[PDB]
Subunit: 184 residues, 2 copies
Amino acid sequence: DKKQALLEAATQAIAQSGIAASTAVIARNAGVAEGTLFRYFATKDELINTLYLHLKQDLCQSMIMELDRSITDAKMMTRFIWNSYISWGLNHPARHRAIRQLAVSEKLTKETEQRADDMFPELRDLCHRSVLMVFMSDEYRAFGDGLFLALAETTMDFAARDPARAGEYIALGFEAMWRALTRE
Amino acid sequence: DKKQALLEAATQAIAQSGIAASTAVIARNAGVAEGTLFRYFATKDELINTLYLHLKQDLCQSMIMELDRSITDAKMMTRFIWNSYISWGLNHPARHRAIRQLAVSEKLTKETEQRADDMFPELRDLCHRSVLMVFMSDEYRAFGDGLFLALAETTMDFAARDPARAGEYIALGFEAMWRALTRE
Ligand SMILES: COc1cc2ncnc(Nc3ccc(F)c(Cl)c3)c2cc1O
Ligand SMILES: COc1cc2ncnc(Nc3ccc(F)c(Cl)c3)c2cc1O
């Protein structure tokens, strides 16, 4: 709860001012001393890693919940997941803002990254099925996510501004992202 | 010289804070009275449109000075422009951040979109031949540039973070942008 509050405050602080966000700020917003933040989190790096798992869990519950398992077609499954992630982001703007910054960032542990993929096994298989091999590689895995997230976050800004054409933005965003990242 | 000072200070504020950037902060960092900004630019929208054409004009000159007209394959020609844009963004981080927020904004006038299009008549004509028709359309043109600027800024962020792989990021980002935006 005091942990939960620090994770809420960390989502708000990071989305607004990115991962350079002050542990001191988070604590005051948390309604505690900085010393409490460090009791709960040994490092700012530990809190970033813990927060990313927190937000990715929150996002995958969304995605898991919406996944019609009758579907097998790779393109069809990914579109579904695209639609889940976008709608998750319209509904939680700060969560989307912090998670996109966290996902690309250098300070994620390998243990953090493994566990995230555990959270939705269906995506890891789909990416192994569909994505250009270069973006599955250790060297450019982060680059391909950063490209997915850029196109998703663009698709989101246009969607919010223009509820009227939101469906076209999502359709056009997804097909753009699919050509970008998958085998031709 | 008050105007050129302000244009530069508007660049730094809108890069940091998006178009939400306060005219109060712009004038102070510009070294002038907020009242004085308003004399040069009667409204915020006014400042936004002028700043946009200013950055667009600086970037297009760079792409024109660097363009090798001995390049005959339309794909290689665009890679060259992408290279110069990325090169420009890495040399000028605040200009690219700012030009992206401005380019994808409701606040730009049709007359601004006209003057901006004509800064490079042949880069314009190139897109007319090469880009997916939906992304040339009245409704979705802003979204196409939106998808392009997101792919380019992510490319610039990875090149800047990890200059060892700078070349492959640029190269990968171009091919992803190419499959994203263009006719097949
Ligand atoms: C087509 O390839 C991808 C599809 C994806 N779908 C959904 N999520 C992806 N990645 C992703 C990775 C990390 C994240 F935090 C978020 Cl919010 C999204 C995807 C990454 C891909 O490379
Ligand atoms: C092939 O598709 C495009 C290629 C582009 N190349 C270079 N520049 C484009 N637009 C652009 C590039 C830089 C900018 F700052 C702005 Cl505001 C717009 C392009 C837009 C496209 O849709």
